[PDB]
């Protein structure tokens, strides 16, 4: 059985749980979700280096005032405390906080557990970040 | 109807990829020189 | 006894890599200069069970100030490289990062990822400034 099937089997049982139909990847191993019709989610199948990516968006540059992505950067440096790192997708004009999991330690367990927390610090960011007020 | 799924107190909704929407040579280590400072 | 397992591979390591010695001190860090013009720092943290590489690439004083935007917009792209950039406040230095678990914290693992590394470093050095 491939990782590809491997992860299909996942989402199938997770999709079972929250109550959606079905969920599989990609012909590029890609599934995008979308939480209180305002954080997406994105999950990445990486078959080459045999890991999973999350990819999820936060908040949009507009209503950012500009210095921020250096206070960004500042926490990438540690972003080993979280498992989590931010990134930019010019783009779109959305801020990305991403978290990876191992083929090794792939399971549905970890899965939800690395997808809620991804969410609480998204949600987090994403009230937090906005100058606008 | 849009089927809507449910978790960790929040919606769940199928979401488009929307790939189309938005979006080098190894150096061996015995070679490179070393300097413990 | 995790920090005599890295001091176990720093100093098989140290032979292999041509250094007299080499081990953690009091803190848990480490300090190496490679070409002379690249820098990586060990540290490892006892109770996360992690080994982390931060690598100086260039200070933000020959940066333009639309810099911080690009660092963010490539840490999307080196997600895949398990690599991402960000800053050091006191120093002052833009840095690449990089970690390696207990669990696949082997000698083989240690070089592969400071190959990689090294690499990465020093072809951001050359573009950075542009």
Request: with cysteine.
């Amino acid at each position: 059985m491939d990782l590809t099937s491997k992860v299909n089997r996942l989402l199938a049982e997770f999709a079972g749980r929250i109550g959606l139909p079905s969920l599989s990847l990609d012909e590029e191993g890609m599934a995008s979700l979308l939480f209180d019709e305002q954080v997406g989610v994105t999950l990445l199948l990486l078959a080459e280096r045999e890991r999973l990516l999350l990819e999820a968006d936060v908040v949009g540059i507009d209503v950012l005032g500009e210095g921020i992505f250096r206070q960004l950067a500042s926490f990438n440096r540690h972003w080993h405390r979280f498992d989590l790192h931010f990134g930019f997708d010019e783009l779109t004009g959305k801020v990305q906080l991403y978290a990876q999991i191992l083929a090794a330690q792939l399971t549905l367990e970890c899965f939800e557990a690395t997808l809620a927390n991804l969410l609480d610090h998204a949600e987090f960011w994403q009230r937090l970040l906005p100058c606008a007020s | 109807t849009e089927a809507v799924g449910h978790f960790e107190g929040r919606s769940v909704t199928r979401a488009a990829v929307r790939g189309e929407d938005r979006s080098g040579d190894g150096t061996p280590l015995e070679a490179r020189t070393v300097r413990r400072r």
